[PDB]
Each structure stands twice: as C-alpha cells, then as structure tokens.
Design a protein around this ligand. Structure first.
Ligand code: PLP
Ligand code: PLP
Ligand code: KAP
Ligand code: KAP
Ligand code: NA
Ligand code: NA
Lengths: 416, 415
C-alpha cells in the first residue's frame, strides 16, 4: 500500500459505522496468519476480535485454504434455481445434523441480516398461509439483529413498523428472579394474537450490550411460545458454532427454536454466507398457502459452502470445547483485576467472550491507537472493551490482549 | 453426487423461489468451464443465463481463478472496521473511475438487496440531516429491487410501507411526452414527501425484461434536479456492459445521485455489492454523525480481488464488440419467433435476448426440454430470455436461440 493509496481510502471509501467527513484512523493490513494480522509496515497484531467474531479458526488456515482452492478448481459459483451441487448438500447435511432435531429445512442466504429477514418472512408467510393476520414481532430490549430494514425493525429502538419490546433479560448467566418475567408476560397477554413470532439472541445479547442472561428465560419463552402457538426465532449469528461454550447457545436451555439464524462463524470468517433453518411444519405451511418468495443471486454459492464445510469439519474434531473452556477460564482470571480499575463498571465472561464494561464511552481512535501500539487488535465500542478471539489462540497471545485491556482501563486517558 | 444426495437436496434444502412440498426438478452440476455447465452424468450444457446474469466472463476463467487464489494466500478476509486493504482500495479506485464523475464515495456491501437497502438508508438519512421529513420513494411499475424488506417496499406491488408507483415507462427502447404526466402528476402531489426516485435504468429486468426509451432518464434526472430530490439508479442487473454500454445510465448521458451495483461486479464468482453516492450525499449524511451500516464481511478481501480481476478483464474493451455482435446475433436468430403462435413480442438489447409469451410457461417441462437440447435456460412467467456470457461462441449462441425457437412452436410447454 502507498500513501496515495491511504489518502484514497480516506477520501473515497466509506467504512462501517463511521463518518465520511471524519473517518477514524484505519490500519493498512497486507495479510493475516494464525491469530495475527500483519500490517503494511511489518508490525504483527494479535487479533482479539476474530474479524467481528467470524474467524473462529484464525487466519490462513490450511484446511480452509485447501477447501476454497479445490472448489475454485471445480467452480466458485453456479445458480441454485433448478440446480444443486455437492458443497451445498454437504453443508445442509451438516447443518441439519448438528442442530436440534425439529430443524431440518435449510434456506441458504448470503449475509446475517438477510438470514434474519428470511426468518421474519417465514414467520409472516406462515400465519398468512393459515389465514391469521399476525404481523408484529415480540423481541427484547438490547437486541441486535442486523442493519437491513426488517432487521432494523426488531433492533433496540435506542442502540419503520412498530414491534413489541420486552425488558432486557436481567437475570445473569446468576440467580433466577421470577420478577424479571412480568414485563414479557404482560406484552404477550396484550398481543398474543398479533404476534407472528418471538425473536431473540439466545443467552448472549451481542452488539446491543454483550449481555449474558440466564438460560431459564429460553425455557420460559419456549414454553409460552408453545402455549400460544407462536413461532420462536433464535438469532445465533453471533452465538453459533461454539462461541458461548456450547455448539449452539440454545443448548444451554436445552430447547429448539422454530427458526434458527446462522452466519458469521459459519464459514470460518473466510467470506460471507448465511443460513436460516426452520422446521417441516413451518416450511410446508409456507409452501401451501405456493412458495417462498426469496432467492438471493448467489444463494448456495459453491465456493462459500465449501469453506463453511471445511470450517464445520474442523469443529467435528471436538477440540473447540476444551479450547473454549480454557479460554473462558483464562479470561476470568486475567480480567478479574479490571474489577479494581476506576473506569470499569462490570466484568463478565462466558465461553470465548470476555467483556469489560466501562463507566464512560471509549474514545475509539485513541483507544485503538493504544492497542495497536501494544501489538494487539481490539475494537472497543461504546462502553465495551470486549475480547472474542479465535478458539486456537495461544495462551500468551491471550495474555497480551488481557494485559492491554487492563492497562487501557487504569484511568480516563482513553475515555469519552 | 449420489441418489441419496439428491433425495436429501429435495427433502431438506429450499431452492430459490419454489416450494418445499413441491420443488421443481433440479439438475446436479459438478463443475463448469467456459460457457458450459457440466452435469453429474457427463452431459454439458450451454449456459444462456450466466448464472442469473453475473457470469459475464463465463466459468473457470484463469484470470479470475488466479486472483482468488492469490488473495486466499494473503487472506480471504479481515474486518473493515478501522482496517483497510489493497483489494478494496483497488476496487474502489476502479469503481470511482469507471462511473460518472459525481459518484466518488464507495460503500461496499455483500449482496444486491443490501446495496439497495443501503441506498434507501442514504436517501433517508440525507433528508433527516437537513431537517426535512421525506420518507417515501417514487419508483415505477414493473420495478424489481431485491427481496429484503426495504427492497420489497419498492418492488411492483403485483409482481409493507406504501411508496408511490408511477406508471411503467411505455416508450420502447419513439419517445412520447404523455408517458410523463403520471410520473409528473405523482411528483406534483408528493414532491416534498419524496426522499428519492429509484428505478432500473433502461432495462427493467425481473419485473418483465422491459426496454424503455432513454429520454425517460433524461427527464427524471431533470425533474429530480428541479425538486432537489435524489436519483437512485439500480444497476445491479444492467451494470458492466450488459445493455451495450458499461453502465446503462450512459444511454441517457446522466448520472444518478446513488448507483447500486452487484451481480456481474465479481464476474459471477461469488457475492459482493456496491452502492456509490456523491460527496454532497456522503458528507450530508455524516453531518446530521455517521452512516449506520456495516455488514460483517464488508469489503471482504477475497470478493474484492475477484471483482478486481473481473473489472480488469473489462478494461481490455473487448466486451463492446462482443456485446455488439451478440446483440446483432440475437436479433437475427429470434426474429422467426415473431411468427410462432405462443409468442407475443421479441425484444433484444445488448446481450439481453427476450421472447415474451402469450401464456405463462411450465418451467419443469420447459427446463427439461432445454436440458435435453444441451442448453441451460431458465424461463420465467411469460419470459424465455437469454442473458449469456459475453465471450460465448456463435455456435453456442445458435443452440440457445434454436432451442428457444423450438420451445415456442406450440402449447406443449405452456401454462
Ligand atoms: C452479526 C449479526 C447480525 C447481522 O449480520 P451482518 O452480517 O452484519 O449483516 C444479526 N444478528 C446478530 C445477532 C449478529 O450478531
Ligand atoms: C438482482 C437484482 C437485485 C437484488 O439482488 P440479490 O443479489 O438477489 O439480493 C436488485 N435489483 C436489481 C435491479 C437486480 O437485478
Ligand atoms: C436472482 C434474483 N432474485 C433476481 O434478481 C432475478 C431473478 C428473478 C426471476 C425469477 C426466476 O428466475 O425464476
Ligand atoms: C459487524 C456487524 N455490523 C455486526 O453484526 C455487529 C458488530 C457491531 C459492533 C459495533 C462496533 O464494532 O463498533
Ligand atoms: Na436439526
Ligand atoms: Na465516479
């Protein structure tokens, strides 16, 4: 990269969630390997974010690289309208088999938000097919489901058609207080017949606050959903594939949703792909009202399916459990001291999710710069300095992250 | 693939736009090369659809294959939040330079519908930043903008917050000023409610493969300027040479405020998308503090590199003669279809060859018939259209056109 290259990026390219007149410093990355990002000048950085939590196996993984290259040799892409192929079949076989039994119908999509939008669409076609007029969604405060319009209608109004917003689950993953239930039950009482589906992120509410709630909630919500005949959508785009300690975070409550959304770590953070699973009752009902009105251009893409197949195969070894278990232990030990810093408000850890919540909103440009100077890549956000590293990170690499996090919260320097 | 593999596909996997209790036959494809799709049994098929019009250079293209493999060796992906890289910079340099001058701000995304949703969001944030309450979109009948919710709100209600739908452009690609009163009438009534105008330039694809007169874009651009309203051009289907010009807006010699790109952007290798806007639009948004959007795999190194390799192939300029000759060749060879009794109209433009029928086709039976002719064509509704790769051989074009002509001889494959 050159300096004219970097002037160009800043003047012409919009980055995610930032200003075009006031971009925040960007760091030029030329390649990646293991759990490190290599910069244009040679500096290496320990990745604590997993490229927004998708790169669970790290970067430049030989199994992933081979899969992708093999598939390119056959075909990166072919349409899926009236055509099918090995990579997609393989992937749907794995997806059906690794998820709760009821979930056996797979609709492949290209990105997380489309996966949510598809789920929403299934929910709505479902009721229309049965003649019921159910159009609202009951979700929770602090939920995040993506940026397209449909997804934006179910995100928290703070963090467009009106949906119902129940209180953020208060009970931590921690004692279960039955009082936490009122808000939700009241809204369900009032709108039960308007509600097409309940949509939530299981256990961990990610972008909406990195909030860890009690598994009993899923137990209850599932029981209420069954009672009323309403569908349960579980948005596991962030939680899926071992992040929280279990393969799917719904396992913690030993329940199955009617619709399950997947993405992010689905492909090993190699490239975009997504999946929305449902049940036979949901898929058949839809068809019978004649079809499911959705079909992304690159749906089922041979190249992305193969990468995801290779990433799901890596998880077949089982090694992620001990890996996430030890990362959980190690984040707990090493962030504990952050409970003594004055900028800290709370420390919560779960699986390979290490969160340090602050009293004051961070100054990203200055905090980012600080982490880069420590040899680590951490992207704070709001009042959250959280780690979500690849499962195969070395203990010493985990130590530099936690050390840099602890140092960052010692005083107000990097705050506000 | 096995027979248990194919039972599994039919019982567990939903395909695009079809039923789960009544899927339509699917054909098992093991690989692709040149302009052919190779099936599990060995049969080869000339592709007349370009994999839903993305594969403009065909399949297993050495330049594309090399680009993708090189980038995988460096990294398929890294996040874009606070990070930038060569492939994206390269791509945005090419996108800025090949599009009208005003369009210099690029927001990379993952798919066609997200590109539209991003455009829509830009339109709305723009007005909000200026204090105006503008929330509706003025689009056209027969427009198709994708399947996510926002996109569904501007698709034709026949082919959800209520937008405004001016009558479809009638003027075939003579011009006539009457076309305009409807659009004009709706604009008169709602000018201050309208945040943006959104349309597919010249060719309205999925909504009917309709080719309209370039004067429309000239007029719409002039009205938009008059009223201070933004012009979104959805070139996800038309972009990168499909209609004979690099961008279909060229036909009218105009620039939209926001341009949506996808499909052929990457050469049909994998998904990627782009929404371009102007500095006035990008800066206004920032100043109301930011643009609230950021796909997880935004700017993905592997997809950007494939698109860089596909844009480079177009840099040679060879697509112009190629699309010109395909246009001539579709004209000649579909002409006779004007004499068939199932045919209602024949329209051709660039590498877009359309045969419109009187009756809706029976896809399962028509598809089967095309597969038996050694061709891959996916009819739809009343349209049997060809949108083949630009480097197709003349003989390969002949088998498609021949198969299309044969299909419309009688009602066998209809309804
Ligand atoms: C990441 C995420 C999404 C949306 O994904 P994108 O790939 O950003 O479009 C949706 N929901 C949850 C819970 C997520 O974590
Ligand atoms: C293909 C297309 C889209 C949407 O794209 P997807 O990739 O299906 O999500 C939108 N608009 C137009 C004009 C298109 O041709
Ligand atoms: C693929 C994508 N949904 C698109 O933009 C156009 C396809 C619509 C035509 C319907 C069909 O091919 O059956
Ligand atoms: C990356 C993608 N938009 C996503 O799903 C959520 C991550 C949001 C984190 C907010 C931030 O990084 O600043
Ligand atoms: Na299952
Ligand atoms: Na430009």
């Amino acid at each position: 990269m050159t300096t004219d290259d970097l002037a160009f990026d800043q003047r012409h390219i919009l980055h995610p969630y930032t200003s075009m007149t006031s971009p925040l410093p960007v760091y030029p990355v030329v390649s990646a390997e293991g759990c490190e990002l290599i910069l244009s000048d040679g500096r290496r950085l320990v990745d604590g974010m997993s490229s927004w939590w998708a790169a669970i196996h790290g970067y430049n993984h030989p199994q992933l690289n081979a899969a992708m290259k093999s598939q390119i040799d056959a075909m990166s892409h072919v349409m899926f309208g009236g055509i099918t192929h090995a990579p997609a079949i393989e992937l749907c076989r794995k997806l059906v088999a690794m998820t709760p039994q009821p979930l056996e119908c797979v609709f492949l999509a290209d990105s997380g938000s489309v996966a949510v939008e598809v789920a929403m669409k299934m929910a709505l076609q479902y009721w229309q097919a049965k003649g019921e007029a159910r159009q609202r969604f009951l979700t929770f405060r602090n939920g995040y489901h993506g940026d397209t319009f449909g997804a934006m209608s179910v995100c928290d109004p703070d963090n467009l058609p009106e949906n119902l917003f129940a209180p953020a689950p208060q009970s931590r993953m921690g004692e279960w207080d039955e009082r936490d239930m009122v808000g939700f039950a009241r809204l369900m009482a009032a709108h039960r017949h308007e509600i097409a589906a309940v949509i939530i992120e299981p256990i961990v509410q990610g972008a909406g606050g990195m909030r860890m709630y009690h598994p009993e909630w899923l137990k209850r919500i599932r029981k209420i959903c069954d009672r009323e005949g309403i569908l349960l959508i579980a948005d596991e785009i962030a939680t899926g594939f071992g992040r929280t300690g279990k393969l799917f975070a719904c396992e913690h409550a030993e329940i199955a949703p009617d619709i399950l959304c997947l993405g992010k770590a689905l492909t090993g953070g190699t490239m975009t792909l997504s999946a929305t699973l449902t049940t036979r009752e949901v898929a058949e009902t839809i068809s019978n009202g004649g079809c499911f009105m959705h079909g992304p251009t690159f749906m089922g893409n041979p190249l992305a399916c193969a990468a995801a197949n290779a990433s799901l195969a890596i998880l077949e070894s089982g090694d992620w459990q001990q890996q996430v278990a030890d990362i959980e232990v190690q984040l707990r030990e090493q962030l504990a001291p952050a409970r003594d810093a004055e900028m800290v408000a709370d420390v919560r850890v779960l699986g390979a999710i290490g969160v340090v919540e602050t009293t004051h909103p961070v100054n990203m440009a200055a905090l980012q710069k600080f982490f880069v100077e420590q040899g680590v890549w951490i992207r704070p956000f709001g009042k959250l300095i959280y780690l979500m590293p690849p499962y195969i990170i070395l203990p010493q690499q985990l130590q530099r992250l936690t050390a840099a996090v602890n140092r960052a919260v010692q005083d107000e320097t990097f705050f506000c």
